[PDB]
Amino acid sequence: QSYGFQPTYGVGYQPYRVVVLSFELLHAPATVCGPKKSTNLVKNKCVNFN
Amino acid sequence: AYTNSFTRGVYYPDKVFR
Numbered sequence: 001q002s003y004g005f006q007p008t009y010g011v012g013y014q015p016y017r018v019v020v021l022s023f024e025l026l027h028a029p030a031t032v033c034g035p036k037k038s039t040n041l042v043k044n045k046c047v048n049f050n
Numbered sequence: 051a052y053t054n055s056f057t058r059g060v061y062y063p064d065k066v067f068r
Contacts, residue, residue, distance in 0.1 A: 028065055 005015045036050075 026064075 003015065005013070
């Protein structure tokens, strides 16, 4: 069946556009990440890292 | 024809090192 979205349908019956994202982990190395300055490395320093 | 696959087909299930 078709929704037949009309302006009259009003705030209750309005048509929304939806997008949904799924995130999975551990099964492979990371490939895509948000903007986060990448830094260099340090050895034998007891650092907290990402 | 058929044959016994003795122990073939084992593969590294994950990308982790142990």
